[PDB]
Design a protein around this ligand. Structure first.
Ligand code: HEM
Ligand code: HEM
Lengths: 374, 374
């Protein structure tokens, strides 16, 4: 009962680094918003930089109030508990271009490459600025998102936005169990544990050798992918076929040759026929760090459901979010493996949006990106 | 703590009448889906009737399993508590036309009139068939909706669908408190209490005098309105101005001349100037049964958030749902008062979708609409 109620009844840890929204338990709901600087503030790099400073300071001041007290009285969230409300601010490479700070762009903020399976909509890609807003309650989330967007109106425009969800802690039979996605799969098993030195090695940017790039010291890079799931096709597969696509069992989450969710995926194991226990094209084989020269990431994603598009196909799937110190040793080589080496999951998924954001560490009395912008 | 956990941890009352989804505590989430019979089943009224019988029986059988056991293993909801999952089935007047049952249409199923403030999109209006799916958890809801839509694929097509939300019970400081909407207003105060004879008088269809219409005995009629809120304009009003628009206080929900949420709205009360305490154009004045020759309804609505449309304006608002025994003595005269007599709330709202559905009573070993269709 205590763990069923904790997420909805407690505030987030506002001191979590680099910013709230990476460590700790992930709340049940997310709103991911990508913003562009308004066309009216782009006369020159100076007017763009002043706009960026205005909105980043405004968001930081409001985030501090939201973390400490919640959405104000007179909002949709009046009368509700803090529900683990957390606000994360991210900066796109395009922001640095727009404000005349190209020489401050770290190598890790390089644009993501195209991949062979991309079906990306340009209006769902990129963005100068990111807000990731999380909460255990949708009304707390809605009230915070409304306030934060209102603070941005004169300097920015919403480029794209997506709401996502997981199960709520209150509805979990076992509150410590790994969540499932819309394909019914246990989702998150192989993430590095947060109390582990592997977590910081995976998530935190490498200390800059160029002081122009040191504004990202202690920060992390977020890759977002909007991945539609082909759920009608997936529904046609029986359970053994679904498990062959993934490499893990649907009921237990165990690797196909194991017995428990936490048993290791043994990529060298062979069955009685001499063929691999984990199929050659199984998702967990091709995504494994062992298949990618050690590339690793922290996946903290959400499901989304946008209803039905005009052609009648369901638009629902995975709001994929991966955290790493450098996309070149995380998302990028792994996604190249999935795209080029024939991940069986490619038959049931479509990457339709994409963005990369730099998420700097919080600093006392300073707003995210201040030492970049000012 | 017990009331914070009850909605997420308990099944719905599957024996609630006319069907689940009207009485009891309303779950935090809803998915409203409107379906049309597929164009391929409309050769004649006989092929349409056979399609209707197929999908209604399929939905009823699946609803029985969902109410008793929840979404199956191998779905997104595996490992979750029942979360008050409830499924309601409704029938549109257009269904009765399509299956050759025009003489079975009760007078109360007459099409809603146009109102002077309508801004309705035709693709967001009407429908042959309704599913209202509710749950306290979004993954339980998503899994049930997926199964129910899958059961409908060969006979129907989704016409429109909208997901809605309230606060979760787990996040309520006071779990018995009335919910708020996206304008921050306390929403639901004047509803008839469920343990009250007024509730059944308000919600339940009047016993038919024509046996051809008796299939709706014990049922209710649902009016759905998709009402966009002009939240950016609303944000410009100070609190006294917001309260003047509504007629009730933002902090307490009391009528302007009262002290407590439950104090009566005294429409005859005058201030020291001789003017009404409750303004002449306040929403709660024009919506009051006293202003409408006793017309009354049971409002069981949800908030929605569909992001931003192509013109950049936020598409969020109220998924209005009103239950009554006859729209002519419920929704219709009240909406005519709001539209024609200048409700101040008209300045901040836009009705963009609309539907009327007949929701018949459940019967032992029979599916909703069986005695109409067979
Ligand atoms: C909708 C698309 C996807 C689905 C449904 C999906 C699902 C899953 C599932 C169920 C697992 C096993 C449990 C776990 O360890 O988390 C897994 C593992 C993993 N996935 Fe995905 N995934 C998707 C896309 C991606 C993408 C785009 C990437 C990276 C580019 C990725 C990287 C990984 C990694 C690194 C692992 C852990 C492998 C290991 O070390 O054992 N996934 N995925
Ligand atoms: C987005 C649009 C609307 C909003 C924000 C809104 C909000 C409210 C609020 C805050 C109350 C007071 C608390 C309560 O008694 O529930 C109220 C009362 C009421 N509303 Fe609305 N409403 C909207 C649209 C409508 C519509 C379309 C109808 C019917 C056609 C309606 C019918 C009523 C009724 C009957 C009452 C109770 C009046 C009484 O007996 O005191 N409302 N509404």
């Amino acid at each position: 009962a205590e763990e069923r109620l904790r997420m909805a009844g407690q505030p987030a840890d506002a001191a979590a680094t680099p910013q709230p929204g990476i460590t700790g338990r992930a709340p049940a709901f997310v709103h991911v918003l990508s913003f562009d600087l308004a066309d009216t503030v782009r006369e020159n790099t100076g007017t763009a930089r002043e706009a960026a400073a205005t909105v980043l300071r405004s968001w930081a001041e409001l985030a501090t109030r939201l973390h400490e007290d919640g959405p104000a009285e007179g909002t949709a969230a009046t009368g509700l508990l803090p529900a683990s409300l957390m606000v994360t601010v991210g900066l796109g490479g395009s922001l640095l271009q727009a404000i005349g700070a190209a020489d401050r762009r770290p190598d890790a903020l390089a644009d993501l490459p195209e991949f062979s399976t991309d079906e990306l909509r340009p209006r769902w890609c990129g963005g100068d600025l990111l807000l990731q807003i999380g909460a255990e309650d949708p009304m707390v989330l809605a009230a915070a998102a409304d306030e934060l967007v209102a603070a941005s109106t004169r300097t920015t425009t919403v480029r794209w936005a997506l709401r996502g969800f997981r199960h709520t802690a209150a509805a979990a039979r076992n509150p410590d169990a790994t969540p499932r996605n819309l394909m019914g799969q246990i989702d998150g098993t192989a993430n590095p544990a947060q109390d582990h030195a592997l977590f910081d090695r995976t998530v935190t940017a490498r200390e800059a050798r160029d002081p122009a790039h040191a504004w990202m010291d202690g920060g992390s890079y977020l890759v977002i992918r909007r991945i539609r799931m082909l759920l009608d096709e997936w529904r046609g597969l029986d359970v053994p076929a679904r498990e062959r696509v993934l490499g893990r069992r649907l009921d237990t989450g165990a690797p196909l040759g194991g017995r428990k969710e936490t048993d290791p995926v043994v990529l060298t194991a062979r069955d009685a026929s001499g063929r691999p226990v984990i199929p050659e094209d199984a998702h967990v084989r091709l995504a494994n760090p062992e298949s990618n020269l050690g590339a690793r990431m922290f996946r903290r994603g959400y499901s989304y459901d946008e209803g039905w598009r005009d052609d009648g196909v369901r638009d629902a799937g995975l709001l994929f979010m991966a955290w790493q110190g450098d996309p070149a040793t995380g998302f990028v080589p792994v996604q190249r493996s999935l795209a080029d080496r024939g991940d069986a999951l490619n038959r049931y998924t479509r990457h339709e949006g994409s963005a990369l954001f730099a998420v700097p560490a919080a600093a006392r009395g300073r707003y995210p990106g201040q030492d970049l912008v000012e």
